[PDB]
CSV table of C-alpha atoms and ligand atoms in Angstrom, one decimal:
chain,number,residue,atom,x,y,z
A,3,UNK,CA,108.3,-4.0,-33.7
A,4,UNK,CA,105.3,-4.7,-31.2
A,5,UNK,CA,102.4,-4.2,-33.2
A,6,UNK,CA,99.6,-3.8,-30.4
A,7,UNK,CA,98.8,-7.5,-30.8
A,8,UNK,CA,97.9,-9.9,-27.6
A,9,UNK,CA,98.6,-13.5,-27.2
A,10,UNK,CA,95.1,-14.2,-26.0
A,11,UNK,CA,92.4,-10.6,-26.9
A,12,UNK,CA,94.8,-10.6,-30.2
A,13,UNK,CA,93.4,-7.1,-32.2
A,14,UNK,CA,91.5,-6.6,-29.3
A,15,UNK,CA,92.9,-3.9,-26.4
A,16,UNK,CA,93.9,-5.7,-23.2
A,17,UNK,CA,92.1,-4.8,-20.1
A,18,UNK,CA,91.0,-1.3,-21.1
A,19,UNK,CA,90.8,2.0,-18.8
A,20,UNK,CA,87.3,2.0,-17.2
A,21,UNK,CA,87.8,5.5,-15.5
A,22,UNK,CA,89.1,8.9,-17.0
A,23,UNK,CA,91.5,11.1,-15.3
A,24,UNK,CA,89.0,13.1,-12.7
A,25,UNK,CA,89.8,16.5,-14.8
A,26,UNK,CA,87.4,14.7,-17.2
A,27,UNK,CA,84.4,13.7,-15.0
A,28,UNK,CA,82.3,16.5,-17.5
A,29,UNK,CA,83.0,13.9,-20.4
A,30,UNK,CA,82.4,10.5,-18.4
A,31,UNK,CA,79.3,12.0,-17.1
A,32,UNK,CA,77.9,12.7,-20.6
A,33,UNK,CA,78.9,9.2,-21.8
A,34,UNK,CA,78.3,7.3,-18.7
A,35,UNK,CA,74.5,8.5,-18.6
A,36,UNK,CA,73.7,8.8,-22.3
A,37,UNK,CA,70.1,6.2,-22.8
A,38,UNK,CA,68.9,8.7,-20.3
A,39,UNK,CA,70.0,12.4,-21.9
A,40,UNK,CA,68.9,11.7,-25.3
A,41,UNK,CA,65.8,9.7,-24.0
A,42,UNK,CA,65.1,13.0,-22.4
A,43,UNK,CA,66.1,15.9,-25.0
A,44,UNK,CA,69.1,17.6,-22.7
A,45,UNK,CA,72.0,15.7,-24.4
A,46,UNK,CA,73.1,18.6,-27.2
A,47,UNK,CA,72.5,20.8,-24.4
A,48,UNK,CA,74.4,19.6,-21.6
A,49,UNK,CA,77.2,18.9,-24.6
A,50,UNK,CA,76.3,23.0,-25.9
A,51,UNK,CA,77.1,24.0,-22.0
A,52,UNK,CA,80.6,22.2,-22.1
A,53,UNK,CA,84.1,24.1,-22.4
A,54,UNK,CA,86.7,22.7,-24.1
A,55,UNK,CA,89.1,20.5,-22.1
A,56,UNK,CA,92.6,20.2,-23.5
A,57,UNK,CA,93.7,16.8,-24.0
A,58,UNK,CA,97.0,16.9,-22.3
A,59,UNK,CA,96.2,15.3,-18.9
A,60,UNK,CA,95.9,11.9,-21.1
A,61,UNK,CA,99.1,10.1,-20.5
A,62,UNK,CA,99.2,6.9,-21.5
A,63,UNK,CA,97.7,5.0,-24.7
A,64,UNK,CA,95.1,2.8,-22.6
A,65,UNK,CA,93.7,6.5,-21.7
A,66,UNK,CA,93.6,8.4,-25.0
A,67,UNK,CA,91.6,5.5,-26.2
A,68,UNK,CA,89.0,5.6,-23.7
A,69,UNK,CA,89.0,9.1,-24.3
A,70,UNK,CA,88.7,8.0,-27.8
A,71,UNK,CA,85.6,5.8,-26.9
A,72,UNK,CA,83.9,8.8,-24.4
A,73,UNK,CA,84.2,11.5,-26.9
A,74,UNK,CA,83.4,8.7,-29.5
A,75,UNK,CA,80.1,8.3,-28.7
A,76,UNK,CA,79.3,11.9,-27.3
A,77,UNK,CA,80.0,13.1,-30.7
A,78,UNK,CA,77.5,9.8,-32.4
A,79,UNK,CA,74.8,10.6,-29.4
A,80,UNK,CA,75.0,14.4,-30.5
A,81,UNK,CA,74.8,14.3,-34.2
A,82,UNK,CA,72.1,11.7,-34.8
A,83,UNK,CA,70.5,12.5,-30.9
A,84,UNK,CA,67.4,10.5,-30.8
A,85,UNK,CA,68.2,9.4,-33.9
A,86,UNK,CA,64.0,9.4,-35.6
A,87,UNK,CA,65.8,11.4,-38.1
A,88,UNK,CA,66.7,15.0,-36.7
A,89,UNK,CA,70.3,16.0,-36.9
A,90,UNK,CA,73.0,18.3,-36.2
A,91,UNK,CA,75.0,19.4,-39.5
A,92,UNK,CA,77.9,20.6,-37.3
A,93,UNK,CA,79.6,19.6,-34.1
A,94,UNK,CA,80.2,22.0,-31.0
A,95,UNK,CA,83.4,23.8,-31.4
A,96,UNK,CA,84.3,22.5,-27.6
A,97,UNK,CA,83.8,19.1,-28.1
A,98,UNK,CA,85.4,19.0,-31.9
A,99,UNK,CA,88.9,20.7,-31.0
A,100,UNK,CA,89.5,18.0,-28.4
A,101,UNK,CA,88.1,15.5,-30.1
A,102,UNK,CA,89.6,16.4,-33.3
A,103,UNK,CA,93.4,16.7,-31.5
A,104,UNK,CA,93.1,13.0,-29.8
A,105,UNK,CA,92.4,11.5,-32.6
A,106,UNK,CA,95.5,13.3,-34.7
A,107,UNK,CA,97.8,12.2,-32.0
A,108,UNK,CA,96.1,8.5,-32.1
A,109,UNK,CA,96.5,8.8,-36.1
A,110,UNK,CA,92.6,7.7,-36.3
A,111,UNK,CA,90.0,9.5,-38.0
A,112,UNK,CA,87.8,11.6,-35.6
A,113,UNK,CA,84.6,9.3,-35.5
A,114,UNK,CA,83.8,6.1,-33.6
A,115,UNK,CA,85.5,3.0,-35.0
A,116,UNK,CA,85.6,-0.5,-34.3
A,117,UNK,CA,88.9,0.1,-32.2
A,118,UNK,CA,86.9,2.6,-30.0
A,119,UNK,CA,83.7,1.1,-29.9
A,120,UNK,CA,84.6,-2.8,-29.6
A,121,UNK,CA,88.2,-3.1,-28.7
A,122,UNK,CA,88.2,-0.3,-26.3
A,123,UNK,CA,85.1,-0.7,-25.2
A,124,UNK,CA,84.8,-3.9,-23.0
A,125,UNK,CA,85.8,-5.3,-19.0
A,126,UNK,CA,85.4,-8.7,-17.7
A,127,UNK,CA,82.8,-8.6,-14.9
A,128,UNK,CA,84.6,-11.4,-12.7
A,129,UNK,CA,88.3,-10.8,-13.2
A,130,UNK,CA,89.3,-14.6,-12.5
A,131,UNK,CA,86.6,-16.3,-15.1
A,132,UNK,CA,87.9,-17.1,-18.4
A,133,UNK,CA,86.5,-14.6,-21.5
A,134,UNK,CA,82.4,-15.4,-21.8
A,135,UNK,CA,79.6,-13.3,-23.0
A,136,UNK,CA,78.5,-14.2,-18.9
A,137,UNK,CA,81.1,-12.7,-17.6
A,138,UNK,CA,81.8,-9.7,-19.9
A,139,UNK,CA,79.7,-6.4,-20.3
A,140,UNK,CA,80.3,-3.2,-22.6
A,141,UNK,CA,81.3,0.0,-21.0
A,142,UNK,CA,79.6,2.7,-23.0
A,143,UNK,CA,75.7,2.2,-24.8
A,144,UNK,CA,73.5,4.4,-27.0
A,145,UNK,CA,70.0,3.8,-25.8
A,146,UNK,CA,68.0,0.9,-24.1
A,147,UNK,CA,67.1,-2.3,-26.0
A,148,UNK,CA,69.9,-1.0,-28.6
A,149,UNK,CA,71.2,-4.7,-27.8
A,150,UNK,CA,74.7,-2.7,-27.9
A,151,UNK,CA,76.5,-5.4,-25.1
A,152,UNK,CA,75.6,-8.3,-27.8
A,153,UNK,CA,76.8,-6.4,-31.2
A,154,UNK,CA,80.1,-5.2,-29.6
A,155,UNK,CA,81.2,-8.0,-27.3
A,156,UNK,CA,79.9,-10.9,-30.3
A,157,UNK,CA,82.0,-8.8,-32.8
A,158,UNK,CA,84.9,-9.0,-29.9
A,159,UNK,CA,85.1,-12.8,-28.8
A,160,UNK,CA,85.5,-13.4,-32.7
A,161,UNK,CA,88.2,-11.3,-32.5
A,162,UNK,CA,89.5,-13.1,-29.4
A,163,UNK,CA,88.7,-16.5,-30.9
A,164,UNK,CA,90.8,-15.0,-34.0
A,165,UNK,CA,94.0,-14.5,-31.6
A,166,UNK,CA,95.0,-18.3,-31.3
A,167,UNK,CA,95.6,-18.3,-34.8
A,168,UNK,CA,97.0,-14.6,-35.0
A,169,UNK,CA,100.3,-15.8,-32.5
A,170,UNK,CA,101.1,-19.0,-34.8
A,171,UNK,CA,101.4,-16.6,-37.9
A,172,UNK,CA,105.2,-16.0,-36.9
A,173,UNK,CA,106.0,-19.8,-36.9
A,174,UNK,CA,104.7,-19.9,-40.1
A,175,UNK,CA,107.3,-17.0,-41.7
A,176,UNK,CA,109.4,-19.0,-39.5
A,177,UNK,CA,109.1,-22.1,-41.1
A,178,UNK,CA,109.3,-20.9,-44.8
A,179,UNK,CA,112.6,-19.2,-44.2
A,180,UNK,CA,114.3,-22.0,-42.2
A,181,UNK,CA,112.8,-24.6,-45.1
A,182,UNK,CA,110.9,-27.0,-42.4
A,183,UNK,CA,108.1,-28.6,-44.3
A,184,UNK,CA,106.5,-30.5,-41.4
A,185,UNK,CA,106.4,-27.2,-39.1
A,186,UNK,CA,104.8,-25.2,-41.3
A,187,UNK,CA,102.0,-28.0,-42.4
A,188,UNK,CA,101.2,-28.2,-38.6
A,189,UNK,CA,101.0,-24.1,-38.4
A,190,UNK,CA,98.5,-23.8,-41.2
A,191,UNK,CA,96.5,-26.9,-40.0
A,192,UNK,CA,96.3,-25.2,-36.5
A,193,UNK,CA,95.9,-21.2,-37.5
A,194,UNK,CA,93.1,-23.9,-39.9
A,195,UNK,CA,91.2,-25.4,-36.2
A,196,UNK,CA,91.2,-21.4,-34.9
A,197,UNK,CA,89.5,-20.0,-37.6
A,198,UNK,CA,86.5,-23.1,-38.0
A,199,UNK,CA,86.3,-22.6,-33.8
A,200,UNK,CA,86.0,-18.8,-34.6
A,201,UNK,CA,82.7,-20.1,-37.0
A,202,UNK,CA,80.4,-21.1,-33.6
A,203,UNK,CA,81.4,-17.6,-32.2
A,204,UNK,CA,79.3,-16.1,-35.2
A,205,UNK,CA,76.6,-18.3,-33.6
A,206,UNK,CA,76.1,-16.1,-30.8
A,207,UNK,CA,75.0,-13.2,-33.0
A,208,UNK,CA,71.4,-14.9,-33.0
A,209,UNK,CA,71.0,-15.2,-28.9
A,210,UNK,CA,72.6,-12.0,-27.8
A,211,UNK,CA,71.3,-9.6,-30.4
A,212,UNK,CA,67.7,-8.5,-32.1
A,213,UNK,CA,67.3,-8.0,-35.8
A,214,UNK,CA,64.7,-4.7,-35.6
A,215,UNK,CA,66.5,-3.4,-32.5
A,216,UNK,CA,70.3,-3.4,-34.7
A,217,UNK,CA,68.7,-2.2,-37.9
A,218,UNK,CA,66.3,0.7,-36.5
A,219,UNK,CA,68.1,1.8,-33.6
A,220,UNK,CA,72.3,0.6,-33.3
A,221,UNK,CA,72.9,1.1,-37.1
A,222,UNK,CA,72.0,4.2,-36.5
A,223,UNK,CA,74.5,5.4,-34.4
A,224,UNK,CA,77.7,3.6,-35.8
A,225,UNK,CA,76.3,5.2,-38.8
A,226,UNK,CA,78.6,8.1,-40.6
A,227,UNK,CA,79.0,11.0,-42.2
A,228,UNK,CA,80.4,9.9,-45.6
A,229,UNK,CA,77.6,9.4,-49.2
A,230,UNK,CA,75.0,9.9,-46.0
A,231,UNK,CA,72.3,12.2,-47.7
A,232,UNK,CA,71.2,12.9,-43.7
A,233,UNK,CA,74.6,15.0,-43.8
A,234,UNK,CA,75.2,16.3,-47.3
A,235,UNK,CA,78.6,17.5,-47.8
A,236,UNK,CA,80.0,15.6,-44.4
A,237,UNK,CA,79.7,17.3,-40.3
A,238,UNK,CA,81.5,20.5,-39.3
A,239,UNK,CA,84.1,20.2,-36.6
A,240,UNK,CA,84.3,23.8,-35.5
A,241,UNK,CA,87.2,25.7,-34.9
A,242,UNK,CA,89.3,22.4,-35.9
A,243,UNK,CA,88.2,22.5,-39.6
A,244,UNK,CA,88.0,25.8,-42.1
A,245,UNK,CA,85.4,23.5,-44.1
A,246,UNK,CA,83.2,20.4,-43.2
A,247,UNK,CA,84.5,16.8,-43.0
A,248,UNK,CA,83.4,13.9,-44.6
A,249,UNK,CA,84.3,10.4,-42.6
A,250,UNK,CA,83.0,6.8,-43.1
A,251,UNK,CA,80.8,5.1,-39.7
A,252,UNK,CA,81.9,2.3,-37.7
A,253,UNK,CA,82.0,-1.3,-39.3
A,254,UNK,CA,84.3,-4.7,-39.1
A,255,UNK,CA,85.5,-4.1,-42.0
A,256,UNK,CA,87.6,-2.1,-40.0
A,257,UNK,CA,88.8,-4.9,-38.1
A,258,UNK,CA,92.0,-6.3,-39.2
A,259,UNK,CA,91.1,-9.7,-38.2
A,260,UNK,CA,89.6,-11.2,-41.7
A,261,UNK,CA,92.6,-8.5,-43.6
A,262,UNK,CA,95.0,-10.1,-41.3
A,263,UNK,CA,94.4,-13.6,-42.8
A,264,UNK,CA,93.9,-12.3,-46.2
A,265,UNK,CA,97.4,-10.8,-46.5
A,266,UNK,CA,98.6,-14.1,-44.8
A,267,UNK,CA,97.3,-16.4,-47.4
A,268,UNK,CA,98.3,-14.0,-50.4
A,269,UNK,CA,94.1,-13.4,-51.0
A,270,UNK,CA,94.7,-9.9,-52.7
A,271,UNK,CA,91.6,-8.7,-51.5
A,272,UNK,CA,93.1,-4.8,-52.1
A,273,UNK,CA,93.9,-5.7,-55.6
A,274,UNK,CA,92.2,-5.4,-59.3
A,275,UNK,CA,91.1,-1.3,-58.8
A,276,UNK,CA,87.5,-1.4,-57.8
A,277,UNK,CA,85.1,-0.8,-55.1
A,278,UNK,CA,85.3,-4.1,-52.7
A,279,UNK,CA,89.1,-3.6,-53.1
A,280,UNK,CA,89.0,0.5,-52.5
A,281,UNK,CA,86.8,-0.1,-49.2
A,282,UNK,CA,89.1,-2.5,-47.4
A,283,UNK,CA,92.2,-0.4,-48.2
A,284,UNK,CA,90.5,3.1,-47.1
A,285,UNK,CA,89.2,1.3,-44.1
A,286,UNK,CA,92.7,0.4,-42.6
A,287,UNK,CA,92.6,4.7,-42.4
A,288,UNK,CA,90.5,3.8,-39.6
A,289,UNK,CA,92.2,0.8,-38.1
A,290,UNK,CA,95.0,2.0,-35.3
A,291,UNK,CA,98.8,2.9,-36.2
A,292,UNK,CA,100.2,-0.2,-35.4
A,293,UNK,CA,97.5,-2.3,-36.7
A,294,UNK,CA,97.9,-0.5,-40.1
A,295,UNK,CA,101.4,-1.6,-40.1
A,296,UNK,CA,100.9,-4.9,-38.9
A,297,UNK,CA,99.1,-5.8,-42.2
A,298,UNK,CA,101.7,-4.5,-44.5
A,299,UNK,CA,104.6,-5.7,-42.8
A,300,UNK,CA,102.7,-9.4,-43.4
A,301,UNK,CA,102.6,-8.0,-47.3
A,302,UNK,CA,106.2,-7.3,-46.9
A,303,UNK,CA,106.6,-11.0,-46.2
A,304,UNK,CA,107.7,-13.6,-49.0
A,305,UNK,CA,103.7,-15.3,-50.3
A,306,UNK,CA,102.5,-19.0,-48.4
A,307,UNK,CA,100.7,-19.0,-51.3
A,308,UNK,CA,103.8,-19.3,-53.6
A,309,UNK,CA,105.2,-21.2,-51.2
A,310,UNK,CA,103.0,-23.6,-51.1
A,311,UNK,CA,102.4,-24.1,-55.1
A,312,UNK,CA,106.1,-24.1,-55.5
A,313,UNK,CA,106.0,-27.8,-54.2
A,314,UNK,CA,103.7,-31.0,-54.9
A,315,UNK,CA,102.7,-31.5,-51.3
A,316,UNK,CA,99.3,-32.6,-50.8
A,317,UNK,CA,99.1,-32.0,-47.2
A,318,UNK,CA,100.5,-28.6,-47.6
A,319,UNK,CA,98.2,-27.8,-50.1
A,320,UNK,CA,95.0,-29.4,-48.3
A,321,UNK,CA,96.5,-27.2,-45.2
A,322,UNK,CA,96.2,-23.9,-46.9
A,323,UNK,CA,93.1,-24.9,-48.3
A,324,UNK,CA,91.2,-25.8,-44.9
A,325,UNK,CA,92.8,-21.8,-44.1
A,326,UNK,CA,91.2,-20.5,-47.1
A,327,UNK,CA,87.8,-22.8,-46.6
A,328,UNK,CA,87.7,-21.5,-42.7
A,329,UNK,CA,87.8,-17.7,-44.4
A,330,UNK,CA,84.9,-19.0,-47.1
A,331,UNK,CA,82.6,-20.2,-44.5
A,332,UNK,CA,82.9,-17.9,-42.2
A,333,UNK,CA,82.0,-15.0,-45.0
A,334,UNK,CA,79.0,-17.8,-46.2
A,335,UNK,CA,77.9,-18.0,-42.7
A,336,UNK,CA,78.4,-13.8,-42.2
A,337,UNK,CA,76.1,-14.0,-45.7
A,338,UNK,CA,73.1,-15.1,-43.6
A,339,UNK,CA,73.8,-12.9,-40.8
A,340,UNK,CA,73.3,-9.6,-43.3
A,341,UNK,CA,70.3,-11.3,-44.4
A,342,UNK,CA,68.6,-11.6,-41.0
A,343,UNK,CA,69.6,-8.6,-39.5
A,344,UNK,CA,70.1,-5.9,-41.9
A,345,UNK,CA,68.2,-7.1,-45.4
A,346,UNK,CA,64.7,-7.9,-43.6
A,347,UNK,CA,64.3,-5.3,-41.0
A,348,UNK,CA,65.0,-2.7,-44.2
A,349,UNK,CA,61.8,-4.9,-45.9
A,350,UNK,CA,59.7,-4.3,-42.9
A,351,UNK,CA,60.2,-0.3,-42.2
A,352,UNK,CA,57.6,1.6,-43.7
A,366,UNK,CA,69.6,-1.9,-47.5
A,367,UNK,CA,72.1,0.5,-46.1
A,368,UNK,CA,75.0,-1.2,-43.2
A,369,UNK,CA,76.7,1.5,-41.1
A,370,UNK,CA,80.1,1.4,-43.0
A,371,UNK,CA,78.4,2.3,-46.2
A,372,UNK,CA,78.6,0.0,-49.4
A,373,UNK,CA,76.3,-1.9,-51.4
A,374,UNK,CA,76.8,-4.4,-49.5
A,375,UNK,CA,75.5,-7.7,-50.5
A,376,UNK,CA,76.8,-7.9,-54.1
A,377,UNK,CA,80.4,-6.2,-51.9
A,378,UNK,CA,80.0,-8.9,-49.5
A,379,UNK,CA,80.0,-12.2,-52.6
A,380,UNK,CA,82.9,-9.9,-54.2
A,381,UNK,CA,84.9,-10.6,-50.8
A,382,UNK,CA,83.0,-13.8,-50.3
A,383,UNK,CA,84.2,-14.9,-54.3
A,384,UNK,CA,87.9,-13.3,-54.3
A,385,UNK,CA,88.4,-15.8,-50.9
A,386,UNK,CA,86.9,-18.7,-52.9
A,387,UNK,CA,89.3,-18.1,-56.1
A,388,UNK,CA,92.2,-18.9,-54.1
A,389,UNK,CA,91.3,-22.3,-53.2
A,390,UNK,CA,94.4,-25.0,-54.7
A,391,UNK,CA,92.9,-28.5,-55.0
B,401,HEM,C1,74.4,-8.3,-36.6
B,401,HEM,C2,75.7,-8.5,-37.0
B,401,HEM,C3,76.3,-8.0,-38.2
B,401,HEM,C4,75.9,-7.3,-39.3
B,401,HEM,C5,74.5,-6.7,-39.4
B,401,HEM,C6,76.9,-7.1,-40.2
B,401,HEM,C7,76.8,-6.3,-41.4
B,401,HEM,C8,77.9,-6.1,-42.2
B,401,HEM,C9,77.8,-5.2,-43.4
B,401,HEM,C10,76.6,-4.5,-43.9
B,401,HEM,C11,79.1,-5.2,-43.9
B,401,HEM,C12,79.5,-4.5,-45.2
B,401,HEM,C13,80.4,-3.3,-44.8
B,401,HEM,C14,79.4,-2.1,-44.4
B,401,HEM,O1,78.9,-1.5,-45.3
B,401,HEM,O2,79.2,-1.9,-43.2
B,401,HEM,C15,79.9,-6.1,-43.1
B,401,HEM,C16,81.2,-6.3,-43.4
B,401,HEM,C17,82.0,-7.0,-42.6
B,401,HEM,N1,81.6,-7.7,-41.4
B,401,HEM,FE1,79.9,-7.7,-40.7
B,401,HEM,N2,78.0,-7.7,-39.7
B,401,HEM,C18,77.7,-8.3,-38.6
B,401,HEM,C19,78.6,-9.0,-37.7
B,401,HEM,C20,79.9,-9.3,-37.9
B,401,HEM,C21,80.8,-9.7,-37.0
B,401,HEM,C22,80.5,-10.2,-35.6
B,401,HEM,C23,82.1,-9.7,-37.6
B,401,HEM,C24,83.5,-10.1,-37.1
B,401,HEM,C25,83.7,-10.2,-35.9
B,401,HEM,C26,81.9,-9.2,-38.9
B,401,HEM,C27,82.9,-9.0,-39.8
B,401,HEM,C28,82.7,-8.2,-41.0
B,401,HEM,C29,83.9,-8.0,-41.8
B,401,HEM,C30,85.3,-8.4,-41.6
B,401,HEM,C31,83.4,-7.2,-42.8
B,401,HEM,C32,84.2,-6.6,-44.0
B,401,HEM,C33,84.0,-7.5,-45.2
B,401,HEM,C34,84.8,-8.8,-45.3
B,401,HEM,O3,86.0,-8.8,-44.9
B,401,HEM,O4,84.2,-9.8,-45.6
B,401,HEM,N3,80.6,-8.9,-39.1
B,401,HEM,N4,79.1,-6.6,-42.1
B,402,AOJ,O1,76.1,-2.6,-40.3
B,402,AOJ,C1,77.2,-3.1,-40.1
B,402,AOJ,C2,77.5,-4.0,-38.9
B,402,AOJ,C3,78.9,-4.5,-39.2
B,402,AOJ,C4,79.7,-4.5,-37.9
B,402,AOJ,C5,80.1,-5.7,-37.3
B,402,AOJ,N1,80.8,-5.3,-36.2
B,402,AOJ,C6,80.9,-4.0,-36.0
B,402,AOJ,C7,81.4,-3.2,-35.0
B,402,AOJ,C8,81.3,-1.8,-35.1
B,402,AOJ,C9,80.6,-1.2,-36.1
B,402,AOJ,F1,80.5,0.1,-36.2
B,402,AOJ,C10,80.0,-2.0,-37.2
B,402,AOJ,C11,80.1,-3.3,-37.1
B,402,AOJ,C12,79.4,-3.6,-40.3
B,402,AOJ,O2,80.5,-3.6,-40.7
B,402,AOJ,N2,78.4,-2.8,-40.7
């Protein structure tokens, strides 16, 4: 089938819906202006004084995801608010029902997730310039200095850089099946070039992003509601929900970018029954329909891996190893990155990411697993 996948914003959605339906100008207000009404104190309020819009004048998929993205961060703005540590235990009734409905139809969870929050939530400021962080901006923010444009948009033009590689994936099932060696060495070698390119993208983290600004302020917000102490026993969606609801926050592990290449080159990073494994399953909950079944229809495939061990081909080999390096040093390099921007900061506030795991000991699980699969 067409699995929402793009031959040049891959995972990413392709020019996004900047504007709501005009029935919904209470919503896009409330988004639109939200560094100001929770810099102020009015934003649970003017949220409080809003009835509940049906969701039915949403009528394509490039819409309900916007809506996705507005009532996304309406509903992260509301809970945490100004976010020094005062919270709301359960969610307006008005807002919720909506909320809650989109989200069933979408088959996503109803909290902000990477789909909403980077993939959704982008435009190109010049629409005939190529894809740049110069000419690119965020539609939705949190609060000022959040650096929110440099998170989201750094986290997408990985996921851009990622597509090049994503489109040869078919050549290489391609290949296998049709039993043409020299095809399938130059597909690995190339889907290889993508994902080292993809390495100087994670570069960018440092310019357009601010360690104490992420850690105290962002992480915040793209927090959750799931083993958060903040929240107890989850948030209440009234009238949706007879009880409340627990939900993991926002993370890239709910991108199917690194899963994608995972499955591809038989890493069984899902497998063995503990908690790295458990995460990256439960978080492909949170990943879109089609996305969800774009990674198991690459399980249903017959394994490279076996593939490529089944014959003693040194350049074959040496080609799914420079895949399976790429994946290492991108994970070593996304080591450093934690380090800087989440381990630190936590040492100077008088660890804890917003997906919710302990992460740097997760992180070398995922990091090691990639490493064990390495040929020679
Ligand atoms: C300031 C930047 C970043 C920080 C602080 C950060 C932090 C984290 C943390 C704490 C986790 C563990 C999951 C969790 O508990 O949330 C994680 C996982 C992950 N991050 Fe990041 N991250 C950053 C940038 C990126 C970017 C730009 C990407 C990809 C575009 C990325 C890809 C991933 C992936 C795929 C995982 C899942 C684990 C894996 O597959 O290896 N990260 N990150
Ligand atoms: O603390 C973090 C940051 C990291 C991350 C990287 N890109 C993202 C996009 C959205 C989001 F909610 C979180 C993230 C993660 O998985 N946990």
């Amino acid at each position: 089938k067409e699995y929402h996948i793009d031959e040049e914003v891959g995972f990413a959605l392709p020019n996004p819906q900047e504007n709501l339906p005009d029935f919904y100008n209470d919503w896009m207000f409330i988004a639109k202006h939200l560094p100001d009404l929770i810099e102020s104190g009015q934003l649970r309020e003017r949220v409080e004084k809003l009835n509940m819009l049906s969701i039915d004048h949403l009528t394509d998929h490039k819409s309900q995801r916007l809506a996705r993205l507005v009532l996304g961060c309406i509903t992260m703005a509301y809970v945490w608010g100004k976010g020094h540590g005062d919270v709301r235990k359960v969610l307006p009734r008005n807002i919720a029902v909506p909320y809650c409905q989109l989200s069933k139809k979408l088959e996503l969870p109803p909290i902000l997730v990477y789909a909403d929050c980077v993939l959704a939530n982008w435009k190109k400021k010049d629409p005939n310039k190529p894809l740049t962080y110069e000419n690119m901006d965020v539609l939705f923010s949190f609060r000022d200095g959040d650096c929110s444009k440099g998170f989201f948009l750094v986290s997408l033009l990985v996921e851009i850089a990622a597509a090049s590689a994503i489109k040869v994936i078919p050549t290489v099932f391609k290949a296998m099946q049709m039993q043409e060696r020299d095809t399938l060495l130059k597909a690995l070698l190339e889907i290889a070039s993508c994902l080292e390119k993809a390495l100087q993208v994670f570069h960018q983290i440092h310019d357009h992003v601010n360690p104490k600004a992420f850690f105290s302020v962002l992480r915040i917000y793209l927090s959750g509601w799931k083993g958060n102490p903040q929240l107890s026993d989850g948030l209440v969606y009234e009238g949706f929900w007879e009880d409340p609801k627990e939900f993991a926050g926002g993370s890239a592990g709910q991108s199917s970018v690194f899963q994608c290449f995972d499955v591809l080159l038989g890493i069984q990073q899902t497998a063995g029954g503990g908690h790295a494994a458990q995460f990256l399953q439960d978080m492909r909950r949170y990943m879109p329909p089609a996305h969800r079944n774009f990674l198991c229809s690459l399980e249903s495939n017959p394994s490279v891996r076996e593939f490529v061990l089944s014959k003693g081909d040194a350049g074959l080999r040496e080609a799914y190893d420079a895949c399976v390096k790429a994946l290492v040093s991108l994970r070593s390099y996304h080591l450093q990155i934690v380090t800087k921007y989440i381990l630190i900061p936590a040492s100077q506030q008088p660890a804890k990411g917003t997906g919710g795991t302990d992460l740097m000991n997760f992180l070398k699980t995922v990091r090691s697993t990639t490493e064990k699969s390495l040929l020679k």
